[PDB]
Design a binder for these strands. Structure first.
Lengths: 181, 51, 18, 168, 106, 124, 50
RNA sequence: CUCUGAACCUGUGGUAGGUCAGCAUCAGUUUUCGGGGGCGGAAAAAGAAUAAGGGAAGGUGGCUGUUUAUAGCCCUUGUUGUAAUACGUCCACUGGGGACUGAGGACUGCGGCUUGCCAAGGAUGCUGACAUAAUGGU
RNA sequence: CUGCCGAAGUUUCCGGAUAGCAGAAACUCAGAUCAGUUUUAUGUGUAAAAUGAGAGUUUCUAGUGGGCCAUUUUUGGUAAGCAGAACUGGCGAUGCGGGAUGAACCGAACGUGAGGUUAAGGUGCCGGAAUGUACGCUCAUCAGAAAGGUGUUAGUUCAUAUGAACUAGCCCUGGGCGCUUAAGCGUACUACCCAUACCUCACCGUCUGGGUUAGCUUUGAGAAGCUCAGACGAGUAGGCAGGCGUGGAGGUUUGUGACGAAGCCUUGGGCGUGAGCCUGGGUCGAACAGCCUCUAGU
RNA sequence: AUGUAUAAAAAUAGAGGUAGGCUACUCUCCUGUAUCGUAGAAGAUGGGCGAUGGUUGAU
């Protein structure tokens, strides 16, 4: 299934694997928005990736994730230039996308790709000492949004419980249960 | 003459042109269900199931 | 095609030398 | 797709050698043609019998007599390294003798980067006694307390909506 | 506006090509729900179409359609090879192709 | 036997686009190190006998007729028995006077005229 | 031609049956039978003209 | 008397010239799913089934040790049998899907069905729409 | 302008005559000889079976009459490399797929096309094709695509569960983005991607082998015609053949032209593989052309 | 364009819910092929019945 707008949560996702699936999707004429890019993960411990950046200048993981894709797409080709603008990488979950579903990519999930006991690095933690100086405010927004979202979930859960009780109380439900519904 | 090449296998009519036997083949034949004499030398089995 | 006999010539196992 | 082929061969009879001896050995080959070629090379190494000097008399594949019963197999192998002279002996627990053989070839091809030509199968035997087992890993697989969670779970339908549970 | 859509959405990926040589006679199409070569057998023979609009009003309408036909599968991920009456423009990469259900074999 | 051509586009001379002293008439490039003569990728094609069209279709207009050049009204008469395969092309210098004599005669003869509406004008 | 096809098929089936029976007997009494050397092979060229 | 399909009335009689799509029955070249079978392999090996014996186990019951118990297993025969599956191979066995081609232009020939007919010495039918734009070219 | 054939690129004596390669002609044979062939066997050579192909002469005449690279072979070397002779191929006269790109590496050698399948190489993205399956190994804090290691991985052997000595792999120390139980390595088995290659067909041409007249109402005798079949298609130097075009010349079209010749421009339409040609429109205003031959300040 | 439909956080090597007084519980996961919506001349004319609710538009 593909949509005109797709929101992908970057928490617990490998950078390269996430970059690959979005690179193909972007060439497919699809708009993809990436949120919480600061919580991306890269195989290899913290010092190695720190040395990698020291050899390498954009401090935003949203820019870094965009930069990784930029060299992973035909940038010279005008088609690649057009597809670049269809990708929107932002840190955290902004209000224009907080009230929308956030899907995940199985091919990039750390739990499905990383062996237990393997060291890994977090981009937001990595970027904190390279020029980024907004971790507190970015974090502060995260708990504020999730607290509001959790309250929304509780209201939705209560509504789901009420309708579920109403659904079971409905005699119509088991009239034609032979269809598996 | 021979404007086209028609496959004897694929075309059944050309097969009759080349094979005046294909009319009567009956390829499948029952050569079993007649008290099959299991044939295996005992010493052959001994050398088979060794080492 | 010829029947190779085995009487007094039973097969002997051989294994590579270490 | 390895399969254990038995090969019996003898030298060409002549007035000097009217009755050739019967040489039979069990080797694992993916097909009959590979088995016969390997048998000739083995005989040249040991008995120095050329292909023209001899001829194969019977080729036959051997199935596992009890393929449904778990067993332990010990194989002696000589392997060619930078020095060109090495010997090893390993044990594996599997339900098929071919399965043990192909398992060792993968291990040899990984640990030592071993080629099919270099490897020569020396000895094959079945491990049955508990005290016969020597390797530590198979020893851990022998005690009746074998219980552990499934390792390497990780279980195109891209863009799964929910987070995977990845638990029980 | 629930209803309509007697077809299946599909995306026009690219042309049949080597690493550097492209043959634009046939184009790769990735149909939704198709994820194996054995599955793409069902869509072999269907009539695919490219639908686009233009400023000129022709016959009183504003729609131009380039028909096509699925021919063979392409790889193990459900892609197909579709030949059109007019070869698709190279700009329509990553667009929408409508795979209607005829000629039906079911 | 329909009128099918192995190629539409003409063969232009190599580098004929860059220069104006160089004519677009096809000239075989005889340059010793000429890579375009050497049939590299990204270059132009080159006339070969492999490009000939069907011998039962050579000289045939897209509607199946072969053009036949009629100077005067005598020439349009001999196409009486090939009107299904030949089309009476009217020469370029034939005056508007004899041009009508050629078209009216050819209309009754049954033959097809290719440039029947040149220099003339109808009147009702 | 039809009758010559009968003889050829009979010859082929008898030859296969004889060879199968020849090996069954040898396996039955333990002797080893070597099949007759083939006289016909089919060669396929695999490398080009370069 | 014929003829001029001669001109008109009479027909409101009958057939309807290119382009482009549609399906069908065929043919050549193919790619892809199937079904049904023959022969061969330790006549697969197994397994279940199957009357026992023995054995030990990582030991049930009895009590780490123990020998079928208050779990049984394994091995050996026995065991139905010509088991079945799988593998390998064949079918002049069969049932579908999809694509690209129509070169040739009376008649022969070679075959099958029964003079005629046919999938047999290369494509023909049913239709439509467009044409009074579609297909086209620059 | 197109079509066919197409080397040599160097022996050998000695600037050359030879030769050789390629042709061009004339011959005699396929029941006759052959082969950068392989066997058999007699003593590696020689002689006599298979596998294929028709084979051999004589005459006369263009071009070449270098090398580079690679393989190998050796000799010495000589700091060390290496050098020196050879040896045999490939490029050179040869494009295409792959190797990031790159003349020497891996594939494959070329008419125009349609379909099919592949070779080498590849399937994370750029990038056409599985983020295939099974099994291990790799942790690098410079991976990856001589040795040492309080470096591991598997371990082996020997000592009495622990150590020591060891076995080996790998890491550390001494094309891009990215990849890390891989998108790395190593093995295996499935599936897929694509070349000017392979198959089937169409078409152009070339060569070869036919058929065809008391010219039979199949009418298809421009016999220089019509028809049938098969294989084939790189190309420099060079050899051969058929054509296109310009000025003028004898013949001809009882040719064209003030109702518009020649010319010229033009995103008009056509024809031919092509040289080239025919035509529509606009300008234009007095000449011009097709065909068969002749001819050259073409 | 063709339903242009969908909001928890967080572990994943345990999380969530469910219930009891953070301590003892229980249940679900093992995805979305889920769920919601999708019935009518693009969804007509009326007759009802039935909800007498629901769906929405308008401000």
């Amino acid at each position: 299934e593909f949509q005109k707008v797709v929101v992908i949560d970057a928490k617990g996702h490998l950078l390269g694997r996430l970059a690959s699936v979005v690179a193909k999707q972007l060439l497919g004429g699809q708009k993809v928005v990436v949120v919480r890019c600061e919580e991306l993960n890269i195989s290899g411990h913290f010092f190695r990736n720190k040395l990698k950046y020291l050899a390498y200048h954009f401090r935003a993981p949203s820019r870094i994730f965009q930069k990784a894709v930029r060299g992973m797409l035909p940038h010279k080709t005008a088609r690649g230039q057009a597809a670049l603008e269809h990708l929107q990488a932002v840190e955290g979950i902004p209000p224009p996308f907080d009230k929308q579903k956030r899907v995940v990519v199985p091919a990039a999930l750390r739990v499905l790709r990383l062996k237990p006991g393997r060291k890994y690095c977090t981009v937001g933690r990595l970027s904190s000492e390279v020029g980024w100086k907004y971790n507190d405010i970015v974090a502060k927004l995260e708990e504020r949004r999730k607290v509001k979202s959790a309250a929304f979930y509780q209201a939705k859960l209560a509504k789901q419980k009420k309708i579920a009780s109403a659904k079971e109380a409905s005699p119509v439900n088991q009239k034609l249960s032979q269809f598996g519904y | 003459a021979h404007v086209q090449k028609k496959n004897p296998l694929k075309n059944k009519a050309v097969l009759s042109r080349l094979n005046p036997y294909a009319k009567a083949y009956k390829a499948n034949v029952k050569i079993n269900s007649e008290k099959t004499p299991k044939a295996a030398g005992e010493k052959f089995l001994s050398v088979l199931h060794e080492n | 095609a010829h029947f190779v006999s085995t009487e007094n010539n039973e097969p002997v196992t051989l294994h590579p030398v270490a | 797709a390895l399969k254990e082929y038995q090969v019996v061969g003898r030298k060409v009879p002549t007035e000097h050698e009217p009755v050739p001896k019967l040489f039979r050995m069990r080797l694992f080959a993916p097909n009959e043609s590979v088995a016969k070629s390997r048998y000739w090379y083995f005989l040249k190494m040991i008995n120095k019998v050329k292909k023209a000097t001899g001829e194969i008399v019977a080729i036959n594949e051997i199935s596992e007599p009890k393929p449904l019963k778990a067993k332990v197999f010990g194989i002696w192998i000589r392997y060619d390294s930078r020095s060109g002279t090495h010997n090893m002996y390993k044990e594996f627990r599997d339900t098929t003798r071919v399965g043990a053989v192909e398992a060792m070839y993968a291990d040899m091809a990984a640990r030592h980067r071993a080629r099919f030509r270099s490897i020569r199968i020396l000895k094959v035997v079945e491990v049955e006694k508990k005290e016969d087992v020597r390797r530590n890993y198979v020893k851990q697989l022998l005690n009746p307390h074998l219980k552990f969670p499934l390792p390497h779970r990780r279980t195109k339908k891209v863009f799964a909506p929910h987070r995977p549970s990845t638990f029980y | 506006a629930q209803g309509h859509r007697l077809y299946v959405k599909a995306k026009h990926l690219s042309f049949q090509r080597s690493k550097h040589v492209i043959h634009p006679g046939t184009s790769i199409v990735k149909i939704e729900g198709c994820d194996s070569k054995e599955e793409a057998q069902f869509y072999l023979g269907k009539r695919v179409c490219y639908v686009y609009k233009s400023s000129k009003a022709v016959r009183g309408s504003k729609i131009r359609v380039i028909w096509g036909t699925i021919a063979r599968p392409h790889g193990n991920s459900g892609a197909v090879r579709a030949r059109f009456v007019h070869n698709l423009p190279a700009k329509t990469f990553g667009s929408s192709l409508r795979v209607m259900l005829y000629p039906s074999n079911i | 036997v329909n009128i099918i051509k192995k190629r539409t586009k003409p063969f232009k001379r190599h580098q004929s686009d860059r220069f104006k002293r160089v004519g677009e008439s096809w000239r075989k490039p005889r340059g010793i190190d000429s890579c375009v003569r050497r049939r590299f990728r990204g270059t132009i094609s080159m006339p070969k006998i492999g490009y000939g069209n069907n011998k039962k279709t050579r000289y045939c207009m897209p509607n199946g007729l072969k053009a036949f050049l009629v100077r005067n009204v005598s020439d349009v008469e001999l196409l009486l028995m090939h009107n299904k395969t030949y089309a009476a092309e009217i020469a370029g210098n034939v005056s508007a006077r004899k041009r009508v004599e050629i078209v009216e005669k050819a209309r009754a003869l049954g033959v097809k005229v290719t440039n029947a509406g040149a220099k003339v004008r109808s009147q009702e | 031609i039809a009758k010559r096809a009968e003889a050829y098929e009979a010859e082929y089936r008898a030859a296969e049956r004889e060879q199968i029976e020849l090996a069954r007997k040898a396996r039955a009494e333990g002797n080893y039978f070597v099949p007759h050397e083939p006289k016909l092979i089919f060669v396929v060229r695999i490398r080009g003209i370069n």
